[PDB]
Write a protein that binds this ligand. Structure first.
Ligand SMILES: Nc1ncnc2c1ncn2[C@@H]1O[C@H](COP(=O)(O)OP(=O)(O)OP(=O)(O)O)[C@@H](O)[C@H]1O
Ligand SMILES: Nc1ncnc2c1ncn2[C@@H]1O[C@H](COP(=O)(O)OP(=O)(O)OP(=O)(O)O)[C@@H](O)[C@H]1O
Ligand SMILES: [Mg+2]
Ligand SMILES: [Zn+2]
Length: 848
């Protein structure tokens, strides 16, 4: 063993040893319990940064822990390769997105290999290969014929100068980002997943996820946005039907989640696109001006809550079906056409939005709910006005005295009897729009034939291959300008036809990649039945909380779709979620990387990302310090969920601890070479050695619980540091001394192998000839945790009457119980009671 830690030498050697042993290349091996640990796969940026290092070290720590415990661990890696960044790089450098992607992939892969992750590279996938995306094309065609995927007109942001559809992210203040021209809203045919059909399942199955963070479930529930409410019809008055056609002539239908307050309705509001708004504005130019100002606004909720709520009265009137009141209709900019009925009732006494609306326009407020003796101020909004759990109805006829749920059900039966309403469930969830007017994505397997309609490509003809010899320009999809791509024959009649030129939402690739990892060379289906049966679901998923919504929702949706097609047999893809805090670092700029700088403006610490260029290249850190220093620093600097600050001092600390670990083992074996680790009965060991073994086996139980239950790796490292501290203060020079030292060192390097496997692998080989992964995770010797018994003097009225042997963990009540039963106290207390029993732990007990 060389004297000095040399990571540049030992880290490649260790990586080659694990590779030749194929410990990370796994099969569906029934002889071993499976563990599937997945980290969210990366987009091929070109270069990884410390955030990716942190995410993937965390996944590798968990994988290696389960490995050492005997599990058949699958930890796969791959590339989320489709999307816009490659298209922007293509426009900049005049290269094909495919070429730019594969070059970024090869570089990032070597970056990952040099960090020493225990990754099954034989299961590697790149989502832009036809071998991958043919299967989401396949599932598209299968769902299309079931109607679960359908084609429908939807609205998009059209830029009339760049001649391209824009996302909302690139429409700033109503104009194009790179053009500034005023955007048109156009309706074009597009494809959708009918995800609303699965809303109840996506909501209820969250209860099955007993090991998910509660907030992630809460975010999923809020996004789906289920509500149980009431459809309520208000009859149109006799005088207010002019211009109304159809059902809109007879009643105004609204949706409310507070039907218990229907007696308190004072006005009603419709969306600017509602038929009643259109009829009233026929001769009112102010209503036309208002309608037009609403239609020229974002229904985006990011602007809806921060929007000033405005309305104008229509002069039209409807009748409340419960109390008979005639209420005026208002047009309001907050009523969204498309959600529910596009019309609402307003109860300003018990809904905050309605309260502010009615205050501005002096519209009436009628109290119908009371919470105790709380006083109702028509001019001041109190938070209990909207209390739904502790309230009771008021001014509501025969509904007086009921609580929310009882009133809800009474209104339900009342309205159904009068035919003016019924219970209804709504969801904020909309269907999932699939179509993108972009080149670098999965082609949509549809053919358009003027005879047969829009026809899916037969499975025998899949994939529809995306041509890779293409350099996008920024002025529209190249696919729609490539007749050699879109000109085809119809698969149903054989006539001349046109391929769909839109591509798929790149969320689709990451919605099932975790199943493809189970059998990524399988060419007869998305995933083989045998491999899906063996691997089941993902045991552990590690990735940022920013994806806790759409990505997770889509992945759970696809899981259920694939289950329904009989491809997998689980309801949920991810059993546990770990979402790691972001790594942050200072900024400089005109955005500059901090590596390029020496101690440009020096702005404020902020998350590492490509947008402000503050991403620190791990390759610089590995060249300077080694992979193990990188991994240790990230695992030690903070709990995984907490944010991590880049610190060169933190790197220096990690490296010097690795030297301390090296120095310890080398010094130990300089002083006499390897011996058999201490094992077995420890009676007869010196107090100092018994205490080091107590520290050792306490450290083992603590590290095991921090890896396996708490997932807090910083404290696990601190515990092993305390073990080494006690080791350093223990004389291990004797023959039993050396045996315990060997046992300590053999445990320490196994305990840290998940964090820093390169140094631990090399150190282990110098301590012990067995294979580290066969010796397995260190076990707890519980005999080593029993401290020694004490002798306690039993006194009666002060005079010593007996002695007792109690444990070193015995409470003051064990001492008191043991003292009263000692045969010396019994025959000197004279059957009298104890007026007081003074207990001094470890010394004596005295009964008074
Ligand atoms: N098209 C619409 N545009 C705007 N508001 C609407 C629309 N349809 C219904 N509403 C109003 O939204 C209210 C609540 O609907 P929503 O789906 O937001 O439930 P919620 O936020 O869970 O309810 P709550 O306010 O009790 O917490 C209904 O009472 C109704 O007054
Ligand atoms: N600064 C950071 N600190 C910690 N983890 C990070 C950081 N930046 C990214 N990650 C994590 O690294 C993983 C890769 O994220 P990234 O945004 O690069 O790609 P992605 O998940 O494929 O999505 P997209 O296609 O939008 O880029 C995620 O789990 C993310 O949470
Ligand atoms: Mg369960
Ligand atoms: Zn045809």
């Amino acid at each position: 063993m060389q004297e000095h830690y040399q990571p540049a030498a030992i880290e490649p050697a260790a990586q080659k040893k694990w590779d030749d042993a194929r410990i990370s290349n796994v099969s569906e091996d029934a002889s071993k319990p499976k563990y599937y640990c997945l980290s969210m796969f990366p987009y091929p940026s070109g270069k990884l940064h410390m955030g990716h290092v942190r995410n993937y070290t965390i996944g590798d720590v968990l994988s290696r822990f389960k490995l050492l415990n005997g599990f058949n661990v699958m930890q796969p890696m791959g590339w989320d390769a489709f999307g816009m960044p490659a298209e922007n790089a293509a426009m900049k450098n005049n290269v094909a997105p495919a070429a730019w992607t594969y070059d970024n992939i090869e570089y990032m892969k070597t970056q990952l290999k040099s960090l020493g992750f225990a990754v099954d590279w034989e299961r590697e996938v790149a989502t832009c290969k036809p071998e991958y995306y043919r299967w989401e094309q396949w599932l598209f065609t299968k769902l299309f014929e079931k109607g679960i995927v359908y084609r429908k007109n939807g609205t998009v942001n059209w830029d009339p100068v760049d001649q391209t559809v824009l996302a909302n992210e690139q429409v700033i203040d109503g104009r194009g980002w790179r053009s500034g021209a005023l955007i048109e809203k156009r309706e074009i045919p597009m494809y959708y997943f009918k995800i609303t059909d699965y809303a109840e399942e996506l909501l209820n199955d969250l209860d099955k996820l007993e090991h998910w963070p509660e907030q992630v479930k809460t975010m999923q529930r809020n996004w789906i946005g289920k509500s149980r409410g009431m459809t309520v019809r208000f009859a149109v008055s006799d005088d207010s039907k002019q211009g109304l056609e159809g059902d809109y002539a007879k009643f105004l239908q609204v949706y409310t989640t507070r039907p218990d307050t229907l007696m308190g309705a004072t006005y009603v509001a419709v969306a600017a696109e509602h038929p009643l708004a259109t009829a009233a504005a026929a001769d009112k130019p102010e209503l036309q001006a208002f309608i037009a100002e609403c239609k020229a606004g974002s229904v985006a909720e990011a602007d809806m809550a921060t929007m000033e709520k405005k309305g104008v009265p229509t002069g039209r009137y409807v009748v409340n079906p419960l109390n008979g009141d005639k209420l005026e209709v208002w047009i309001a900019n907050y009523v969204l056409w498309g959600y529910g009925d596009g019309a609402v009732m307003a109860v300003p006494a018990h809904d905050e939005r309605d309260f502010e609306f009615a205050a501005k326009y002096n519209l009436p407020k009628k109290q119908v709910i009371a919470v105790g003796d709380n006083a109702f101020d028509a001019n001041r909004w109190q938070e209990w006005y909207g209390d739904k759990e502790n309230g009771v109805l008021v001014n509501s006829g025969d509904l007086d005295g009921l609580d929310f749920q009882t009133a809800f059900d009474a209104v339900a039966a009342k309205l159904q009897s009068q035919g003016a309403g019924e219970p209804k469930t709504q969801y904020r969830l909309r269907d999932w729009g699939i179509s993108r007017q972009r080149y670098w994505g999965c082609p949509i397997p549809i053919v358009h034939c003027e005879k047969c309609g829009n026809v899916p490509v037969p499975a025998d003809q899949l994939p529809v291959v995306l041509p890779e010899n293409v350099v996008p320009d920024g002025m529209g999809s190249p696919l729609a300008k490539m007749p050699e791509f879109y000109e085809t024959s119809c698969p149903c009649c054989g006539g001349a036809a046109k391929r769909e030129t839109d591509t798929m939402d790149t969320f689709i690739e990451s919605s099932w990649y975790f199943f493809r990892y189970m059998s990524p060379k399988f060419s007869d289906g998305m995933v083989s039945a045998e491999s899906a049966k063996y691997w089941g679901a993902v045991d552990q998923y590690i990735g940022g909380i920013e994806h806790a919504i759409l990505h997770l929702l889509y992945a759970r949706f696809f899981t259920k779709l694939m289950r329904d097609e009989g491809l997998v047999n689980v309801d949920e893809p991810f059993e546990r979620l770990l979402t790691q805090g972001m790594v942050v670092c200072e900024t400089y700029y005109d955005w500059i990387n901090p590596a390029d700088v020496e101690l440009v403006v020096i702005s404020g610490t902020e998350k590492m990302s490509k947008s402000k260029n503050n991403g620190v290249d791990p390759q610089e850190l590995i060249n300077a310090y080694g992979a193990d220093t990188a991994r240790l620093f990230m695992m030690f600097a903070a709990p995984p969920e907490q944010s991590l600050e880049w610190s060169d001092s933190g790197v220096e600390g990690a490296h010097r601890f690795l030297r301390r670990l090296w120095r310890t083992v080398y010094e130990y074996l300089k002083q006499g070479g390897a011996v058999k680790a201490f094992a077995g009965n420890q009676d007869g060991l010196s107090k100092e050695l018994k205490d080091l073994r107590h520290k050792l086996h306490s450290t083992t139980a603590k590290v095991s619980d921090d890896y396996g239950r708490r997932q807090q790796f910083n404290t696990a490292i601190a515990a092993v540091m305390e073990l080494l501290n006690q080791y350093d203060k223990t004389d291990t020079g004797s023959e039993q001394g050396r045996a315990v030292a060997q046992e300590v060192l053999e445990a320490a390097v196994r305990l840290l192998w998940p964090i820093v496997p390169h140094i631990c692998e090399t150190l282990w080989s110098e301590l012990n000839g067995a294979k580290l992964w066969e010796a397995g995770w260190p076990t707890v010797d519980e005999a080593a945790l029993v401290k020694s018994e004490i002798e306690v003097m039993v006194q009666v009225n002060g005079k010593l009457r007996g002695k007792i042997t109690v444990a070193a963990d015995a409470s003051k009540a064990d001492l008191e119980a043991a003292a009263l039963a000692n045969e010396g106290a019994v025959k000197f207390m004279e059957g009298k009671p104890a007026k007081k029993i003074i207990v001094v732990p470890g010394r004596l007990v005295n009964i008074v």
